[PDB]
Enzyme design. Structure first.
Site, PDB file in Angstrom:
ATOM      1  N   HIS A 453      14.495  34.397  55.059  1.00  0.00           N
ATOM      2  CA  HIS A 453      13.682  33.993  56.209  1.00  0.00           C
ATOM      3  C   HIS A 453      13.760  35.030  57.328  1.00  0.00           C
ATOM      4  CE1 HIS A 453      11.913  30.162  55.107  1.00  0.00           C
ATOM      5  NE2 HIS A 453      13.034  29.876  54.467  1.00  0.00           N
ATOM      6  N   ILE A 612      -1.538  17.011  53.738  1.00  0.00           N
ATOM      7  CA  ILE A 612      -0.562  15.988  53.364  1.00  0.00           C
ATOM      8  C   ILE A 612      -0.038  15.337  54.633  1.00  0.00           C
ATOM      9  CG2 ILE A 612       1.595  15.466  52.209  1.00  0.00           C
ATOM     10  CD1 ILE A 612       1.159  18.087  50.617  1.00  0.00           C
TER      11      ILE A 612
HETATM   12  O1  LIG Z   1      24.438  42.303  37.598  1.00  0.00           O
HETATM   13  C1  LIG Z   1      25.651  42.133  37.846  1.00  0.00           C
HETATM   14  O2  LIG Z   1      26.315  42.813  38.656  1.00  0.00           O
HETATM   15  C2  LIG Z   1      26.383  41.036  37.086  1.00  0.00           C
HETATM   16  O3  LIG Z   1      27.353  41.717  36.323  1.00  0.00           O
HETATM   17  C3  LIG Z   1      28.007  40.902  35.381  1.00  0.00           C
HETATM   18  O4  LIG Z   1      28.963  41.658  34.614  1.00  0.00           O
HETATM   19  C4  LIG Z   1      28.396  42.525  33.667  1.00  0.00           C
HETATM   20  C5  LIG Z   1      29.248  43.440  33.046  1.00  0.00           C
HETATM   21  C6  LIG Z   1      28.761  44.324  32.096  1.00  0.00           C
HETATM   22  C7  LIG Z   1      27.417  44.295  31.757  1.00  0.00           C
HETATM   23  N1  LIG Z   1      26.939  45.244  30.747  1.00  0.00           N
HETATM   24  O5  LIG Z   1      25.756  45.214  30.441  1.00  0.00           O
HETATM   25  O6  LIG Z   1      27.765  46.012  30.271  1.00  0.00           O
HETATM   26  C8  LIG Z   1      26.544  43.385  32.358  1.00  0.00           C
HETATM   27  C9  LIG Z   1      27.040  42.502  33.316  1.00  0.00           C
HETATM   28  C10 LIG Z   1      28.785  39.824  36.128  1.00  0.00           C
HETATM   29  O7  LIG Z   1      29.234  38.871  35.191  1.00  0.00           O
HETATM   30  C11 LIG Z   1      27.962  39.104  37.190  1.00  0.00           C
HETATM   31  O8  LIG Z   1      28.826  38.467  38.103  1.00  0.00           O
HETATM   32  C12 LIG Z   1      27.066  40.029  38.003  1.00  0.00           C
HETATM   33  O9  LIG Z   1      26.134  39.188  38.650  1.00  0.00           O
HETATM   34  C13 LIG Z   1      25.905  39.627  40.007  1.00  0.00           C
HETATM   35  O10 LIG Z   1      24.688  40.313  40.115  1.00  0.00           O
HETATM   36  C14 LIG Z   1      23.624  39.584  39.549  1.00  0.00           C
HETATM   37  C15 LIG Z   1      22.401  40.490  39.570  1.00  0.00           C
HETATM   38  O11 LIG Z   1      22.118  40.776  40.923  1.00  0.00           O
HETATM   39  C16 LIG Z   1      23.372  38.303  40.346  1.00  0.00           C
HETATM   40  O12 LIG Z   1      22.462  37.475  39.642  1.00  0.00           O
HETATM   41  C17 LIG Z   1      21.251  37.326  40.427  1.00  0.00           C
HETATM   42  O13 LIG Z   1      21.451  36.435  41.502  1.00  0.00           O
HETATM   43  C18 LIG Z   1      20.329  36.288  42.345  1.00  0.00           C
HETATM   44  C19 LIG Z   1      20.737  35.476  43.570  1.00  0.00           C
HETATM   45  O14 LIG Z   1      21.479  34.482  43.414  1.00  0.00           O
HETATM   46  O15 LIG Z   1      20.307  35.851  44.682  1.00  0.00           O
HETATM   47  C20 LIG Z   1      19.170  35.678  41.562  1.00  0.00           C
HETATM   48  O16 LIG Z   1      18.054  35.526  42.412  1.00  0.00           O
HETATM   49  C21 LIG Z   1      17.362  34.267  42.196  1.00  0.00           C
HETATM   50  O17 LIG Z   1      18.053  33.113  42.627  1.00  0.00           O
HETATM   51  C22 LIG Z   1      18.366  33.077  44.007  1.00  0.00           C
HETATM   52  C23 LIG Z   1      19.215  31.828  44.216  1.00  0.00           C
HETATM   53  O18 LIG Z   1      18.386  30.712  43.995  1.00  0.00           O
HETATM   54  C24 LIG Z   1      17.096  33.115  44.868  1.00  0.00           C
HETATM   55  O19 LIG Z   1      17.381  33.286  46.249  1.00  0.00           O
HETATM   56  C25 LIG Z   1      17.301  32.023  46.944  1.00  0.00           C
HETATM   57  O20 LIG Z   1      15.987  31.654  47.298  1.00  0.00           O
HETATM   58  C26 LIG Z   1      15.909  30.358  47.849  1.00  0.00           C
HETATM   59  C27 LIG Z   1      14.425  30.030  47.999  1.00  0.00           C
HETATM   60  O21 LIG Z   1      13.622  30.908  48.376  1.00  0.00           O
HETATM   61  O22 LIG Z   1      14.057  28.879  47.696  1.00  0.00           O
HETATM   62  C28 LIG Z   1      16.717  30.230  49.138  1.00  0.00           C
HETATM   63  O23 LIG Z   1      16.802  28.856  49.451  1.00  0.00           O
HETATM   64  C29 LIG Z   1      16.803  28.543  50.861  1.00  0.00           C
HETATM   65  O24 LIG Z   1      15.511  28.565  51.457  1.00  0.00           O
HETATM   66  C30 LIG Z   1      14.565  27.694  50.876  1.00  0.00           C
HETATM   67  C31 LIG Z   1      13.228  27.841  51.586  1.00  0.00           C
HETATM   68  O25 LIG Z   1      13.427  27.628  52.968  1.00  0.00           O
HETATM   69  C32 LIG Z   1      15.069  26.265  51.005  1.00  0.00           C
HETATM   70  O26 LIG Z   1      14.184  25.411  50.345  1.00  0.00           O
HETATM   71  C33 LIG Z   1      16.454  26.133  50.390  1.00  0.00           C
HETATM   72  O27 LIG Z   1      16.938  24.827  50.585  1.00  0.00           O
HETATM   73  C34 LIG Z   1      17.377  27.145  51.053  1.00  0.00           C
HETATM   74  N2  LIG Z   1      18.701  27.037  50.443  1.00  0.00           N
HETATM   75  S1  LIG Z   1      19.985  27.432  51.297  1.00  0.00           S
HETATM   76  O28 LIG Z   1      21.176  27.186  50.573  1.00  0.00           O
HETATM   77  O29 LIG Z   1      20.032  26.667  52.487  1.00  0.00           O
HETATM   78  O30 LIG Z   1      19.895  28.813  51.560  1.00  0.00           O
HETATM   79  C35 LIG Z   1      18.140  30.728  48.894  1.00  0.00           C
HETATM   80  O31 LIG Z   1      18.877  30.816  50.092  1.00  0.00           O
HETATM   81  C36 LIG Z   1      18.184  32.075  48.183  1.00  0.00           C
HETATM   82  O32 LIG Z   1      19.505  32.346  47.770  1.00  0.00           O
HETATM   83  C37 LIG Z   1      16.236  34.292  44.433  1.00  0.00           C
HETATM   84  O33 LIG Z   1      14.996  34.257  45.099  1.00  0.00           O
HETATM   85  C38 LIG Z   1      16.025  34.323  42.919  1.00  0.00           C
HETATM   86  N3  LIG Z   1      15.376  35.593  42.571  1.00  0.00           N
HETATM   87  S2  LIG Z   1      14.567  35.779  41.200  1.00  0.00           S
HETATM   88  O34 LIG Z   1      13.541  34.803  41.075  1.00  0.00           O
HETATM   89  O35 LIG Z   1      13.979  37.072  41.229  1.00  0.00           O
HETATM   90  O36 LIG Z   1      15.464  35.662  40.109  1.00  0.00           O
HETATM   91  C39 LIG Z   1      18.850  36.645  40.427  1.00  0.00           C
HETATM   92  O37 LIG Z   1      17.783  36.187  39.626  1.00  0.00           O
HETATM   93  C40 LIG Z   1      20.088  36.849  39.562  1.00  0.00           C
HETATM   94  O38 LIG Z   1      19.776  37.786  38.556  1.00  0.00           O
HETATM   95  C41 LIG Z   1      24.663  37.534  40.634  1.00  0.00           C
HETATM   96  O39 LIG Z   1      24.459  36.641  41.708  1.00  0.00           O
HETATM   97  C42 LIG Z   1      25.835  38.453  40.976  1.00  0.00           C
HETATM   98  N4  LIG Z   1      27.100  37.699  40.932  1.00  0.00           N
HETATM   99  S3  LIG Z   1      28.265  37.997  41.995  1.00  0.00           S
HETATM  100  O40 LIG Z   1      29.454  37.345  41.570  1.00  0.00           O
HETATM  101  O41 LIG Z   1      28.496  39.397  42.074  1.00  0.00           O
HETATM  102  O42 LIG Z   1      27.896  37.519  43.282  1.00  0.00           O
HETATM  103  N1  LIG Z   2      -0.512  20.737  52.839  1.00  0.00           N
HETATM  104  C1  LIG Z   2       0.408  20.267  53.684  1.00  0.00           C
HETATM  105  N2  LIG Z   2       0.015  19.434  54.673  1.00  0.00           N
HETATM  106  C2  LIG Z   2       0.939  18.967  55.521  1.00  0.00           C
HETATM  107  N3  LIG Z   2       2.247  19.206  55.557  1.00  0.00           N
HETATM  108  C3  LIG Z   2       2.603  20.054  54.574  1.00  0.00           C
HETATM  109  C4  LIG Z   2       1.769  20.609  53.622  1.00  0.00           C
HETATM  110  N4  LIG Z   2       2.487  21.430  52.763  1.00  0.00           N
HETATM  111  C5  LIG Z   2       3.717  21.347  53.203  1.00  0.00           C
HETATM  112  N5  LIG Z   2       3.859  20.537  54.303  1.00  0.00           N
HETATM  113  C6  LIG Z   2       5.103  20.190  54.986  1.00  0.00           C
HETATM  114  O1  LIG Z   2       5.797  21.381  55.283  1.00  0.00           O
HETATM  115  C7  LIG Z   2       7.231  21.148  55.179  1.00  0.00           C
HETATM  116  C8  LIG Z   2       7.839  22.172  54.254  1.00  0.00           C
HETATM  117  O2  LIG Z   2       7.846  23.464  54.892  1.00  0.00           O
HETATM  118  P1  LIG Z   2       8.560  24.704  54.186  1.00  0.00           P
HETATM  119  O3  LIG Z   2       7.919  24.974  52.871  1.00  0.00           O
HETATM  120  O4  LIG Z   2       8.392  25.908  55.088  1.00  0.00           O
HETATM  121  O5  LIG Z   2      10.008  24.384  53.983  1.00  0.00           O
HETATM  122  C9  LIG Z   2       7.396  19.695  54.733  1.00  0.00           C
HETATM  123  O6  LIG Z   2       7.603  18.854  55.860  1.00  0.00           O
HETATM  124  P2  LIG Z   2       8.566  17.575  55.817  1.00  0.00           P
HETATM  125  O7  LIG Z   2       9.995  17.970  55.564  1.00  0.00           O
HETATM  126  O8  LIG Z   2       8.446  16.828  57.108  1.00  0.00           O
HETATM  127  O9  LIG Z   2       8.063  16.711  54.679  1.00  0.00           O
HETATM  128  C10 LIG Z   2       6.054  19.402  54.078  1.00  0.00           C
HETATM  129  O10 LIG Z   2       5.792  18.014  53.993  1.00  0.00           O
END
Ligand SMILES: O=C(O)[C@H]1O[C@@H](Oc2ccc([N+](=O)[O-])cc2)[C@H](O)[C@@H](O)[C@@H]1O[C@H]1O[C@H](CO)[C@@H](O[C@@H]2O[C@H](C(=O)O)[C@@H](O[C@H]3O[C@H](CO)[C@@H](O[C@@H]4O[C@H](C(=O)O)[C@@H](O[C@H]5O[C@H](CO)[C@@H](O)[C@H](O)[C@H]5NS(=O)(=O)O)[C@H](O)[C@H]4O)[C@H](O)[C@H]3NS(=O)(=O)O)[C@H](O)[C@H]2O)[C@H](O)[C@H]1NS(=O)(=O)O
Ligand SMILES: Nc1ncnc2c1ncn2[C@@H]1O[C@H](COP(=O)(O)O)[C@@H](OP(=O)(O)O)[C@H]1O
Ligand SMILES: OC[C@H]1O[C@H](O[C@H]2[C@H](O)[C@@H](O)[C@@H](O[C@H]3[C@H](O)[C@@H](O)[C@@H](O[C@H]4[C@H](O)[C@@H](O)[C@@H](O)O[C@@H]4CO)O[C@@H]3CO)O[C@@H]2CO)[C@H](O)[C@@H](O)[C@@H]1O
Ligand SMILES: [Cl-]
Ligand SMILES: [Cl-]
Ligand SMILES: [Cl-]
Ligand code: NA
Ligand code: NA
Ligand code: NA
Length: 670
Positions: A453, A612
């Site tokens: 974000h 919505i």
């Molecule tokens: O690669 C390595 O280094 C790995 O190595 C391995 O060892 C070996 C050894 C030898 C070999 N060999 O070949 O010889 C190979 C491998 C190890 O075993 C291993 O540990 C190591 O792994 C590390 O590195 C990896 C590669 O980078 C990594 O794996 C990746 O992790 C990514 C990650 O977690 O970021 C992952 O990305 C996807 O998932 C993420 C998590 O979900 C996504 O990011 C999230 O996105 C969310 C979202 O947008 O919805 C966001 O949520 C928040 O916001 C939303 C919207 O407002 C809200 O709705 C949520 O509620 C809110 N949540 S919150 O909690 O409040 O925040 C999240 O915040 C955000 O995190 C991401 O978008 C995804 N990307 S993707 O779609 O492109 O995949 C990726 O895919 C993985 O590949 C490991 O994490 C590393 N491990 S570590 O121990 O080193 O840390």
């Molecule tokens: N088409 C739409 N019309 C109205 N509200 C919408 C919508 N699409 C998403 N929202 C609202 O946007 C919020 C989600 O935002 P974001 O994706 O950025 O996290 C939610 O609010 P609420 O938590 O009140 O339900 C959801 O209901």
């Protein structure tokens, strides 16, 4: 607010020592302590603190502020028996009635009068017009004709209103909040006379309450304009003074705005019955009002019995004569915006830095809560070249419907080569035709590559680097109370966004700069009260913070400047950055958002956006007092959203009307 006690707020120019005496008798008879305070700006502090659990049990002010408080749910409805109601003049209950309900106890009628020193001027002038000649005579004796507070529009309004100025037009049983009369010919004539007095050096633009009072009470100026409260200090200085009708302007009476000093009871007071007892049985009696009146005179009191006793006072008679010639103040919420607007206009016109016409035109805009935008502001035309180097950057602010909007960007746009969204995968590949370069920087395309974000500050410093172009920034906004409630519910179910970088001036903030609100791994289960109670809660004003250039205020270090300085900078910066974006939408207007995006970027979506209404925020049952506290915690976002909504709606109407005219022309040429 402590139960079993009474805390009272009254302005510093009123008889607060006399009120304290009424408080001591109440305490004698009941053991309930009464504390009187007179904090500065109490009328601005009250809606900030009443909306929490602080504030006084009883607040005194002129009635014009109380409709705003009532609309925000900050005042208890008062329930006086018809027996008590008849003890006061009905005229004064009207002043304190809002949407049919009584929301305060009326105390006294206040109007400004002309006050003159009989030892310098035994016959005061009847017209404003003769004051310049009088001043010339007096200046040759080392004195001046007239000094009064030019900093508060209360004191200059009588002349501005005289020849036709008005606040809000009254018609069809209500005040028309769009019909403002601060820049009509009458208002301009009144203010021009005042400005000419200053230009011709008969008054000084810097004169405020203190300077005018000091001069009159030292016999340096023959006249002042002031209210009944001012009589006490004049008597203290032993001035031989009369109180009379304000001078006429162009043959018409000066028209003071008439105030009714009124006592409201905090809706959050645990002492409402005691407050009613104090006000009805102690203050609003001949004895109680006499105590206050002997400290600082109240004017014409609302209690019939005591008003009759004092009615023989010629100073009060003069007060009633100016009140009948003036107007009762509206009590509507928009009164504060009227006053703020006129305050600034008079100061700038009186200073000579702006003409009367320009200053009152600005006051007219502000008092009617209007926004003026240039054609350039409404015109957002992007020849978006996906084969070129153009990049769209979607700045996603939490809980503005950015998931829905971001999904539209990667799933729903008609393109020759659309984004490639593989099934069961979060992101899509949004590449230009035949290249490995993205045209869209966004959560669902490039990911969070500049931070989770990432806000305006982070993106503008990171996007150009992490892609190497024309960058077209876009975002979504949502009404702040709904957005804040949505964020509360999401945090309550585990969201933290704890991995956000919050980069600014090249570093993330320190824990001292940005304290966490929760112990442990998240804030799950938090009540709305505890959510609102954390001072470092990033939900507060999130949209302004995430749209502003945070370097302008020292990033997250709150000690670098005061709030009075940081807040206007953040708001102006957010307004500017938002306005100058290629496009933004509003969550509550999904169809207009789609239409404007399409017409801005010359693109079309596959499927229509949908509204919505049954959101999680909408499902929260919100008391008015609690809505008001959320607004206060988000007061910068509230102002930003009012601005953004009006610009957005003016953009929609502009683009629609242009497109409707173009279609017609096509028809009228075939
Ligand atoms: O690669 C390595 O280094 C790995 O190595 C391995 O060892 C070996 C050894 C030898 C070999 N060999 O070949 O010889 C190979 C491998 C190890 O075993 C291993 O540990 C190591 O792994 C590390 O590195 C990896 C590669 O980078 C990594 O794996 C990746 O992790 C990514 C990650 O977690 O970021 C992952 O990305 C996807 O998932 C993420 C998590 O979900 C996504 O990011 C999230 O996105 C969310 C979202 O947008 O919805 C966001 O949520 C928040 O916001 C939303 C919207 O407002 C809200 O709705 C949520 O509620 C809110 N949540 S919150 O909690 O409040 O925040 C999240 O915040 C955000 O995190 C991401 O978008 C995804 N990307 S993707 O779609 O492109 O995949 C990726 O895919 C993985 O590949 C490991 O994490 C590393 N491990 S570590 O121990 O080193 O840390
Ligand atoms: N088409 C739409 N019309 C109205 N509200 C919408 C919508 N699409 C998403 N929202 C609202 O946007 C919020 C989600 O935002 P974001 O994706 O950025 O996290 C939610 O609010 P609420 O938590 O009140 O339900 C959801 O209901
Ligand atoms: O930031 C600028 C200033 O803002 C603040 O003053 C504001 C008030 O908050 C508004 O409510 C309004 O004030 C009105 C007032 O509501 C109205 O009753 C009348 O006030 C009279 C009062 O009735 C009378 O009893 C006596 O006390 O004199 C008062 C006038 O001084 O008129 C007011 C307008 O002059 O608007 C003002 C801005 O003008 C804040 O308190 C200021 O400190 C701040 O500088
Ligand atoms: Cl990511
Ligand atoms: Cl819509
Ligand atoms: Cl188009
Ligand atoms: Na969600
Ligand atoms: Na916790
Ligand atoms: Na609701």
């Amino acid at each position: 607010i402590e139960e079993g006690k009474l805390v009272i707020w009254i302005n510093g120019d009123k008889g607060y020592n006399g009120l304290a005496e009424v408080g001591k008798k109440f305490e004698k008879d009941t053991g309930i302590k009464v504390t009187v305070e007179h904090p500065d700006k109490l009328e601005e502090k009250f809606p900030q603190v009443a909306a929490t659990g602080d504030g006084p049990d009883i607040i005194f002010w002129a009635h014009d502020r109380f409709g705003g408080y009532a609309q925000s749910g900050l005042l208890a409805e008062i329930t006086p028996a018809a027996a008590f109601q008849d003890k006061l003049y009905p005229f004064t209950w009207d002043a304190v009635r809002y949407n049919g309900k009584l929301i305060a106890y009326p105390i006294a009628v206040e109007a400004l009068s002309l006050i003159y020193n009989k030892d310098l001027l035994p016959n005061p002038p009847k017209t404003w017009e003769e004051i310049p000649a009088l001043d010339k005579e007096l200046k040759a004796k080392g004195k001046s004709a007239l000094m009064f507070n030019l900093q508060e529009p209360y004191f200059t309004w009588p002349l501005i209103a005289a020849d036709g100025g008005y606040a809000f037009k009254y018609a069809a049983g209500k005040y028309d909040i769009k019909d403002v009369g601060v820049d009509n010919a009458g208002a301009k004539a009144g203010l021009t006379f005042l400005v000419d007095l200053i230009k011709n050096k008969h008054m000084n633009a810097d004169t405020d309450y203190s300077i005018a009072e000091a001069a009159f009470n030292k016999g340096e100026t023959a006249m002042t304009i002031n209210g009944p409260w001012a009589w006490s200090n004049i008597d203290t200085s032993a001035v031989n003074y009369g109180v009379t009708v304000l001078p006429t302007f162009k043959g018409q009476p000066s028209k003071p705005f008439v105030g009714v000093l009124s006592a409201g009871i905090n809706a959050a007071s645990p002492n409402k019955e005691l407050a009613k007892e104090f006000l009805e049985n102690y203050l609003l009696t001949d004895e109680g009002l006499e105590a206050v009146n002997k400290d600082k005179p109240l004017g014409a009191v609302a209690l019939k019995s005591y008003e009759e006793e004092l009615a023989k006072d010629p100073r009060i008679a003069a007060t009633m004569e100016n009140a009948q010639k003036g107007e009762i103040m509206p009590n509507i919420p928009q009164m504060s915006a009227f006053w703020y607007a006129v305050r600034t206009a008079v100061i700038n016109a009186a200073s000579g830095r702006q003409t009367v016409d320009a200053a009152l035109a600005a006051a007219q805009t502000n008092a009617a809560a209007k926004f003026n935008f240039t054609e350039r502001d409404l015109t957002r035309d992007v020849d978006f070249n996906i084969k070129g180097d153009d990049v769209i950057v979607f700045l996603h602010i939490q809980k503005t419907g950015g998931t829905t909007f971001g999904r539209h960007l990667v799933r729903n746009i008609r393109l020759e080569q659309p984004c490639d969204c593989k099934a069961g995968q979060k992101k899509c590949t949004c590449h230009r035709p035949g290249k490995q370069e993205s045209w869209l920087f966004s959560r669902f395309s490039t990911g969070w590559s500049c931070g989770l974000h990432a806000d305006w500050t982070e993106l503008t410093n990171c996007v150009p680097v992490i892609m190497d172009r024309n960058f077209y920034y876009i975002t979504m906004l949502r009404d702040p109370v709904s957005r804040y409630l949505s964020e509360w519910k999401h945090v309550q179910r585990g969201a933290t966004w704890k991995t956000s970088l919050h980069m600014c001036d090249g570093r993330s903030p320190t824990q001292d700069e940005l304290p966490t609100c929760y112990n442990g791994d998240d804030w799950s289960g938090v009540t709305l009260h505890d959510f609102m109670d954390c001072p470092s809660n990033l939900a507060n004003n999130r949209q302004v913070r995430m749209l502003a250039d945070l370097s302008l205020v020292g990033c997250y270090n709150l000690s670098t400047m005061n709030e009075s300085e940081r807040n206007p900078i953040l708001l102006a910066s957010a307004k500017s950055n938002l306005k100058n974006m290629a496009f933004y939408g509003l969550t509550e207007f999904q169809r207009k958002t789609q239409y404007l995006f399409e017409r801005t970027f010359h693109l079309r979506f596959i499927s229509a956006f949908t509204q919505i209404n049954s959101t999680r925020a909408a499902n929260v049952e919100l008391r008015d007092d609690m809505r008001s506290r959320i607004e206060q915690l988000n007061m910068l976002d509230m102002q930003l959203y009012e601005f953004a909504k009006d610009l957005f709606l003016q953009r929609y109407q502009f683009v629609r009307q242009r497109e409707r005219q173009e279609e017609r022309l096509k028809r009228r040429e075939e």
